[PDB]
Swiss-Prot record:
The modification Phosphoserine is found at S10, S36, S49, S99. Belongs to the 5'-AMP-activated protein kinase beta subunit family. Disulfide bonds: none annotated. Coiled coil: none annotated. AMPK is a heterotrimer of an alpha catalytic subunit (PRKAA1 or PRKAA2), a beta (PRKAB1 or PRKAB2) and a gamma non-catalytic subunits (PRKAG1, PRKAG2 or PRKAG3). It comes from the Eukaryota. The modification Phosphothreonine is found at T89. It comes from Rattus norvegicus (Rat). Non-catalytic subunit of AMP-activated protein kinase (AMPK), an energy sensor protein kinase that plays a key role in regulating cellular energy metabolism. In response to reduction of intracellular ATP levels, AMPK activates energy-producing pathways and inhibits energy-consuming processes: inhibits protein, carbohydrate and lipid biosynthesis, as well as cell growth and proliferation. AMPK acts via direct phosphorylation of metabolic enzymes, and by longer-term effects via phosphorylation of transcription regulators. The chain holds residues 67 to 163 of 271 of the full protein. This is 5'-AMP-activated protein kinase subunit beta-2. Phosphorylated when associated with the catalytic subunit (PRKAA1 or PRKAA2). Phosphorylated by ULK1 and ULK2; leading to negatively regulate AMPK activity and suggesting the existence of a regulatory feedback loop between ULK1, ULK2 and AMPK.
Length: 105
């Protein structure tokens, strides 16, 4: 028998960057996040929290667009900064900053 985990299979070769700010609260079975930060070629797992679902990924300083995927379908929150993509597909909006100037050093 065995429990827990030993080593990881994923990797983070990308450069340094701050975490993303995501918070989804509905009550589905599985929640995933995807945006331009990954070319929408992969679904990032949302760390299920006692409070709600959330996502964490080191993204570059700038503005990116992501989308939620719950209940086996791509959904979005009306409270969040959503926008109708060129393909008529509604997507969320995220804005990341840098900590190079925020620090006094």
């Amino acid at each position: 028998g065995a429990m827990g985990i030993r080593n990881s299979d994923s990797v983070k070769p990308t450069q340094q960057a701050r975490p993303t700010v995501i918070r989804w609260s509905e009550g589905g079975k599985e929640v995933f996040i995807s945006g331009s930060f990954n070319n929408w070629s992969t679904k990032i797992p949302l760390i299920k929290s006692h409070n709600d679902f959330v996502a964490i990924l080191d993204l570059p300083e700038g503005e990116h667009q992501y989308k939620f995927f719950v209940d086996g379908q791509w959904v979005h929150d009306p409270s969040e900064p959503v926008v109708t993509s060129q393909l008529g597909t509604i997507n969320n909006l995220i804005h990341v900053k840098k900590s190079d100037f925020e620090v006094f050093d």
